[PDB]
Design a protein around this motif. Structure first.
Motif, PDB file in Angstrom:
ATOM      1  N   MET A  65     -77.333 -76.464  62.567  1.00 59.07           N
ATOM      2  CA  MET A  65     -76.759 -75.248  62.001  1.00 59.07           C
ATOM      3  C   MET A  65     -75.434 -74.903  62.671  1.00 59.07           C
ATOM      4  O   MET A  65     -74.694 -74.043  62.200  1.00 59.07           O
ATOM      5  N   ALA A  66     -75.147 -75.576  63.778  1.00 59.33           N
ATOM      6  CA  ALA A  66     -73.883 -75.397  64.482  1.00 59.33           C
ATOM      7  C   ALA A  66     -73.521 -76.675  65.223  1.00 59.33           C
ATOM      8  O   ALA A  66     -74.385 -77.508  65.490  1.00 59.33           O
ATOM      9  N   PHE A  67     -72.241 -76.831  65.548  1.00 59.04           N
ATOM     10  CA  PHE A  67     -71.779 -78.002  66.286  1.00 59.04           C
ATOM     11  C   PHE A  67     -72.442 -78.065  67.658  1.00 59.04           C
ATOM     12  O   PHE A  67     -72.727 -79.145  68.174  1.00 59.04           O
ATOM     13  N   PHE A 127     -76.442 -84.770  62.122  1.00 57.72           N
ATOM     14  CA  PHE A 127     -75.148 -84.222  61.745  1.00 57.72           C
ATOM     15  C   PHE A 127     -75.238 -82.705  61.775  1.00 57.72           C
ATOM     16  O   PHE A 127     -76.324 -82.140  61.908  1.00 57.72           O
ATOM     17  N   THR A 128     -74.094 -82.043  61.656  1.00 58.56           N
ATOM     18  CA  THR A 128     -74.089 -80.627  61.340  1.00 58.56           C
ATOM     19  C   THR A 128     -74.148 -80.569  59.820  1.00 58.56           C
ATOM     20  O   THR A 128     -73.683 -81.494  59.155  1.00 58.56           O
ATOM     21  N   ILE A 129     -74.731 -79.512  59.264  1.00 55.99           N
ATOM     22  CA  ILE A 129     -74.922 -79.454  57.815  1.00 55.99           C
ATOM     23  C   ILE A 129     -73.597 -79.430  57.046  1.00 55.99           C
ATOM     24  O   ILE A 129     -73.483 -80.031  55.977  1.00 55.99           O
ATOM     25  N   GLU A 169     -65.895 -78.671  57.990  1.00 55.56           N
ATOM     26  CA  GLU A 169     -66.201 -78.491  59.405  1.00 55.56           C
ATOM     27  C   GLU A 169     -66.514 -77.026  59.681  1.00 55.56           C
ATOM     28  O   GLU A 169     -66.228 -76.162  58.854  1.00 55.56           O
ATOM     29  N   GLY A 170     -67.105 -76.744  60.838  1.00 58.29           N
ATOM     30  CA  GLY A 170     -67.384 -75.372  61.224  1.00 58.29           C
ATOM     31  C   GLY A 170     -68.816 -75.117  61.649  1.00 58.29           C
ATOM     32  O   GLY A 170     -69.553 -76.047  61.977  1.00 58.29           O
ATOM     33  N   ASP A 171     -69.200 -73.843  61.651  1.00 53.90           N
ATOM     34  CA  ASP A 171     -70.551 -73.431  62.013  1.00 53.90           C
ATOM     35  C   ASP A 171     -71.137 -72.492  60.966  1.00 53.90           C
ATOM     36  O   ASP A 171     -70.405 -71.795  60.260  1.00 53.90           O
TER      37      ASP A 171
END
Ligand code: NA
Lengths: 147, 147
Positions: A86-88, A106-108, A115-117
Motif C-alpha cells: 500500500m506504500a513504497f 510490488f507497490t499497487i 508511482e506514489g503511495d
C-alpha cells in the motif's frame, strides 16, 4: 492465478479496504482471483476500522465486517501469486522481512502504471476515507485488467 | 499467472490458432498472460497450416507465420500455470501420463464452464477453419476474463 495479497501497516484500513474491493469485483467478473490482507505491524484481534466498514458499504455495497487484522507470515507470501504494498515503505520492508520473492512484491500503484503511495486515512473524516476507497477502486479496476 | 499452454494433437491447426488470437487479445488489453502451444504427437519443424495462417490473417489480422510444430515435453508442462486442451482426448492423454500435473490440466471448453471439443479443421474448407477460429475467439474471450 488464484491469490493476490494486499499488505499495509495496521491492517485495519487500506489493505482490508482493497481486499473487499478486489474480492467483490472479481466475484462479479467470474475471475478466479481472490484477495486477502495482512499487515507488517498488525494488532491481531482487531476489526477493520468502523470508518472503513462504512465507506465500502455506503459507496459500493461491500461488507467487510468479518475482517480481523493479521500479521504477515512467510506463508501468506508462499500462498500468494502476487503481493501488493500500500506504500513504497511497505514494499521496502517486504524485501527485508521474508527471504525474498521480490519478483512478486510490488507497490499497487507501480504494478499498474504510476508511482506514489496510497493515502493512509486512519483518524480522518469520512470524505478522505471516501477518496481512499475511491482511489483504491480505480487502481483495482486496472489491476484486474492486468490480472 | 503468465503462461497458458494450448494442447493439440499435432500442433498445426487449433493450438497455433488458439495461441495466436489469445496473444492478440492479450496484446490489446494490457494483460500479463502469454500463450504457448504443443502437440501430443506432433512432428517437429512443421509450420501452422496455410489455411489457419490465412484464416487468422484475413479475419483477425494476426499472423502466426513464425509458428513451428513442437511435440510436448516436460519443459512446457512445468512452466505452464495452466494448460488447456482443445479436446477431451488431448486432456486424457496428458493426465494419464502426467498425473499431479493434472491439477492444471483442463479442456478448453470445460475450463470456461462448457462441454465438448474444438474439432480438427484438418484439410477442411476455409469456412470450417473460419468457424473454428470464431469458436476459439469466443472461448478465449471467456478465458481472458476468468484468468
Ligand atoms: Na502504492
Amino acid at each position: 492465478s488464484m491469490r493476490v495479497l494486499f499488505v499495509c501497516t495496521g491492517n485495519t484500513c487500506r489493505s482490508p479496504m482493497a481486499e473487499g474491493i478486489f474480492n467483490a469485483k472479481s466475484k462479479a467478473l467470474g475471475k478466479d482471483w481472490e484477495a486477502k490482507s495482512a499487515g507488517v505491524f498488525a494488532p491481531e484481534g482487531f476489526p477493520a476500522s468502523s470508518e472503513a466498514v462504512e465507506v465500502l458499504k455506503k459507496e459500493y455495497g461491500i461488507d467487510i465486517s468479518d475482517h480481523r487484522a493479521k500479521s504477515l507470515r512467510e506463508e501468506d507470501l508462499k500462498g500468494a501469486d502476487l503481493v501488493l504494498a500500500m506504500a513504497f515503505s511497505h514494499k521496502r520492508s517486504l524485501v527485508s522481512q521474508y527471504p525474498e520473492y521480490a519478483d512478486k512484491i510490488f507497490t499497487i500503484k507501480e504494478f499498474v502504471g504510476l508511482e506514489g503511495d496510497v493515502e493512509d486515512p486512519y483518524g480522518m473524516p469520512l470524505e478522505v476515507y471516501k477518496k481512499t476507497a475511491e482511489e483504491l477502486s480505480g487502481l483495482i479496476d486496472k489491476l484486474i485488467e492486468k490480472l
